[PDB]
Design a protein around this nucleic acid. Structure first.
Lengths: 149, 262, 129, 141, 151
RNA sequence: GAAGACGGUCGAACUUGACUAUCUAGAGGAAGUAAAAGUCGUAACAAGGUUUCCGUAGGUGAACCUGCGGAAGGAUCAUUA
RNA sequence: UUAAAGUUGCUGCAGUUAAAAAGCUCGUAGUUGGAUCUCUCUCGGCCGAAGCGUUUACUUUGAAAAAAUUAGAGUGUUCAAAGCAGGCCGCCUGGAUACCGCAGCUAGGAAUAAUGGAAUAGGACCGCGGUUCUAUUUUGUUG
RNA sequence: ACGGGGAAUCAGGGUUCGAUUCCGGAGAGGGAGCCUGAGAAACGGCUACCACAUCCAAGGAAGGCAGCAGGCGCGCAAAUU
């Protein structure tokens, strides 16, 4: 059941049992990594690079071809962002709710909807401070967030 | 309180003295001496209760005051003098000699002994220190200090004291394979061979002992008294040989020993 | 959320002996489920079962005999000394003749009659009769 | 449902000792406010001095006059209406007499017919009422 | 001068530091011999105890204390005094009626020697019992292992 | 080497303030309690003769009445292309 | 005052209408958390030292836990409650034993449950080189 | 509320009592200070003060039963100078 919603919805991806790279795929792991470096130099997230190779280049799982997954390729080449992918998209979303909120003060919908985006940020910042992906003094302050994204 | 106690209640007495409940409020309260008051048998209990020589605590006074009683070869006119382990009680008017050794059940025993054995006793070495222009000393468990000991006497060994002179004759060292008696705890009065000694630095050594039937037990190191070199005891032993019978076969001994009657 | 996978996999096979079925599906399986199920099988309560291996966490299909009255879990897994096993098998079992308490000792997941022989305490996992 | 963890004994032990307070049998014996309100102070009996003989009326479905006695207790000065039990037992009592009083039997509640009366006379003038009623003894003056 | 911050002269009291020397002693080296000792329960004396210049009369490696009794442990919480820290010990107390436990904690003020420098809060430390060092302090820090979130 | 004094310290206790707490004399009125089978309506239980109940504001001899907004624990589980 | 009282409920109660679910949601502490991993080096006489391994909880053993009370063994107080006595024709006896929570010592087990161990490799194991300090034996003693 | 050893009840879990003869603490009307001594802040020792109170020739003198008995008071409530 979804965290800050009353919906108990079931929709996801179903990975197959056969874990091997299939027969027709004529891309080696070095060629896939070379594709990933260009698609990251274009300025895409790890969640967007895995889509482009699936749709156009026919790569089902990059973890199945290369042996490593997407983020551990970019963080080993060096072309990786400091704050992670999902924490960025929450901080960037809480900016646009907060930016729109100074225009319309009476909107008590997005005033409630800001706290849910707020309370998801501290759930992730706690996790990243625990796993030491973030420095242990990083805090979300509501005024500096226009220069974090 | 303010200053030391001079009475002993009866229920608060040591259990092994075997004083009954209804004879009085007070128990004999051992005098200060060589032994701890929990580890001793006063001379009033040896004469009145065990030997049945006296009948009241005034007849023990009348017996001891005729100077008929020597404890370790010195005449004792205190009826609450604490006699303890390996102490020789010589009564010369009758001709008996006793040694205080524990038996298998955690008490003392009336152990009559031959006057050829009553000229010596064993002691256990407790602290060894030098001093006073470099002269070495022992301290045994009777507080007997014997200056100029043998250099191969160390702590936890056993000396053999000559009781007329006070001097050491020969000793046993603490090793494995030596015959030992347990003088404290729940395995008290038990005789076995030292198997093993586990060291716990900053705490107590545990000394695993092995019976003559195979019954292994352990104690702390301070409840260990080396009696013999090898397996031969340098003193005599009581009627039971320091080997504790479980209560089933202790029952079987009675219900088979009554069948020798008629 | 699913706290206690062994709890949901025993009330899945409790609720189907009621309804009279001959097979259960119990997903997901841990290996505490397979040890518990093997103890019930060795005392004739269950019969043969098959571990379906998807790459995630297996499911089990268990063929049922009609012999199990009750299958239960104790939560939390209290610690049980061997001198305190009689109170547990008097609160949980229907008689002195049948029924078993499963506890996880350091010698393996076992009964209460096995744990008495090998002289072992453990933590109580559950019961069946 | 109840909490059921293995480290939850402080939640369990302290929920009970707050929930124990809603038990009126618990509270009336642990709060202390009903033992300073008790006229005895937690004694089985007490002595007093008879002020007057007020006789009080029975409750609703049955009619009589219960003969009582207004007592003023010695040990704390409190006043008490106690019931003189059998028949012809007010005729052993005069005013200003010393009376040992008991409870009635319901532990500080009234006993059915009599309204608001929680005590009964036991002895008058240091002789027993059962000794006077059954004629075993004589009233001492 | 990096030691003598006090109003009396900080001096390791067993070591004589005014021995008369000859011309190869004044020209060679100004060598202060240091007093250290071995705590007897398998705690290694640090090299800072053998090479330092700190002076501490309650340090268990260089001062006048002997470690005897219980050897315990705890994690650091507050280092805000002069030479002493606050550790908290965590334990579970069994309640018999409910057959359950409860979280419990107790604090200890404990002396930290200057040989254990660069100690951060939140790491496990072994403590050792000695005589009273102050009104509340009776343990001395013996070895400092670092929390698992270090490198 | 006694009496006695200076100074220090320990400290019972005393005096007067403040905060209290408790034993004690006094008109006035105050609230609930023991009953009441005393008088006017009949609010409620039937569609209880204004369906009832809930919150909230106002007015009275009073049970209450009325304005707003709910609920059915309603007197409808339903009203026709 | 205890049982009766499953009317205080850990075992083991209740919460639509009988007394009772917070108006709704977020949230720190607390409580609870999904699969997964099959003992060796330097010495003494092959057998002991010394080290461990990431730390514990758990479980089993040990030793230490005052007597009296409680349980329980023996014993015809004339029976019994008691007592620690007694029995045989000077001798032969007994005065046992269990239990003694939590905390602290000890040793075996390794299932369960917490926890570590290398991810910008200042990682393991190897032999290679450098820098600083320095053992105490070596030159019949002696500087 | 002196604490334990323990006591009552009890299927299992529990609940309540433990002033009371054994161990440990404290205290001798209330606080305080000492002398002697190995040991006391001792009360069947002393010095004060606060509280009671005995003799007196009115100047003075002596006190401490929560020891055993016994008395009064208190009280529902407890034995022989």
């Amino acid at each position: 059941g979804r965290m800050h919603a009353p919906g108990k919805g079931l929709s996801q991806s179903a990975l197959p049992y056969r874990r091997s790279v299939p027969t027709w795929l004529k891309l080696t792991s070095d060629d896939v990594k070379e594709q990933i470096y260009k698609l990251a130099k274009k300025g895409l997230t790890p969640s967007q690079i895995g889509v482009i190779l699936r749709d156009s280049h026919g790569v089902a799982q990059v973890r199945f071809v290369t042996g490593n997954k997407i983020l551990r390729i970019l963080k080993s080449k060096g072309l990786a962002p400091d704050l992670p992918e999902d924490l960025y998209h929450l901080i960037k979303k809480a900016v646009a709710v907060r930016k729109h909120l100074e225009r319309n003060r009476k909107d008590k919908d997005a005033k409630f909807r800001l706290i849910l985006i707020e309370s998801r940020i501290h759930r992730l910042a706690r996790y990243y401070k625990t796993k030491r992906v973030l420095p242990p003094n990083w805090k979300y302050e509501s005024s500096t967030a226009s220069a974090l994204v | 309180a303010r200053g030391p106690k001079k009475h002993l209640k009866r229920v608060a007495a040591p259990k092994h003295w075997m004083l009954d409940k209804l004879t009085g409020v007070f128990a004999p309260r051992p005098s200060t001496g060589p032994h701890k008051l929990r580890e001793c048998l006063p001379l009033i209990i040896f004469l009145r209760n065990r030997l049945k020589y006296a009948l009241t605590g005034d007849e023990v006074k009348k017996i001891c005051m005729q100077r008929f009683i020597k404890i370790d070869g010195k005449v004792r006119t205190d009826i609450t003098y604490p006699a303890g382990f390996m102490d020789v009680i010589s009564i010369d008017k009758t001709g008996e000699n006793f040694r205080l050794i524990y038996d298998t059940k955690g008490r003392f025993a009336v152990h009559r002994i031959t006057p050829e054995e009553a000229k010596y006793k064993l002691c256990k070495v407790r602290k060894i220190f030098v001093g006073t222009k470099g002269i070495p000393h022992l301290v045994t468990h009777d507080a007997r200090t014997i200056r100029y000991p043998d250099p191969l006497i160390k702590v936890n060994d056993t000396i053999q004291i000559d009781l007329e002179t006070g001097k050491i004759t020969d000793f046993i060292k603490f090793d494995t394979g030596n015959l030992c008696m347990v003088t404290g705890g729940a395995n008290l009065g038990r005789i076995g061979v030292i198997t093993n000694r586990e060291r716990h630095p900053g705490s107590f050594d545990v000394v695993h002992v092995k019976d003559a039937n195979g019954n292994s037990f352990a104690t702390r190191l301070s409840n260990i008294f080396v009696i013999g070199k090898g397996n031969k005891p340098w003193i005599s032993l009581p009627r039971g040989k320091g080997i504790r019978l479980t209560i089933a076969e202790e029952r079987d001994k009675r219900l088979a020993a009554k069948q020798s009657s008629g | 959320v699913r706290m206690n996978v062994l709890a949901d996999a025993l009330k899945s096979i409790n609720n189907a002996e009621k309804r009279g079925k001959r097979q259960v599906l119990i997903r997901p399986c841990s290996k505490v489920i397979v040890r518990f199920l093997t103890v019930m099988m060795k005392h004739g309560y269950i019969g043969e079962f098959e571990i379906i291996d998807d790459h995630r966490a297996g499911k089990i299909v268990v063929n049922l005999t009609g012999r199990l009255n009750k299958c239960g879990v104790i939560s939390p897994r209290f610690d049980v000394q061997l001198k305190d096993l009689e109170k547990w098998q008097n609160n949980l079992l229907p008689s002195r003749q049948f029924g078993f308490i499963v506890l996880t000792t350091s010698a393996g997941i076992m009964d209460h009659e096995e744990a008495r022989r090998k002289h072992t305490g453990g933590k109580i996992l559950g019961f069946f009769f | 449902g109840k909490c059921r963890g293995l480290r939850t004994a402080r939640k369990l032990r302290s929920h009970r000792r707050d929930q124990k307070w809603h038990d009126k049998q618990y509270k009336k014996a642990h709060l202390g406010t009903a033992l300073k309100a008790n006229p005895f102070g937690g004694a089985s009996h007490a002595k007093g001095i008879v002020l007057e003989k007020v006789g009080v009326e029975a409750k609703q479905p049955n009619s009589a006059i219960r003969k009582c006695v207004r007592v003023q207790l010695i040990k704390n000065g409190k006043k008490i209406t106690a019931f003189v039990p059998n028949d012809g037992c007010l005729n052993f009592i005069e005013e200003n007499d010393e009376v040992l009083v008991a409870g009635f039997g319901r532990k500080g509640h009234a006993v059915g017919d009599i309204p608001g009366v929680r005590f009964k006379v036991v002895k008058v003038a240091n002789v027993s009422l059962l000794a006077l009623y059954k004629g075993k003894k004589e009233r001492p003056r | 001068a990096d030691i003598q911050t006090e109003r009396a002269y900080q001096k390791q009291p067993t070591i004589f530091q005014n021995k008369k020397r000859v011309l190869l002693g004044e020209t060679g080296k100004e060598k202060l011999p240091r007093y250290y000792k071995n705590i007897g329960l398998g705690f290694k004396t640090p090299k800072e105890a053998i090479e330092g210049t700190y002076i501490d009369k309650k340090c268990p490696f260089t001062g006048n204390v002997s470690i005897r009794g219980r050897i315990l442990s705890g994690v650091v919480t507050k280092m805000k005094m002069q030479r002493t820290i606050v550790i908290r010990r965590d334990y579970l107390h069994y309640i018999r009626k409910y057959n359950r436990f409860e979280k419990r904690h107790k604090n200890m003020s404990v002396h930290l020697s200057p040989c254990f420098r660069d100690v951060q809060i939140g790491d496990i430390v072994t403590v050792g019992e000695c005589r009273p060092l102050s009104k509340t302090v009776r343990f001395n820090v013996l070895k400092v292992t670092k929390a698992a979130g270090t490198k």
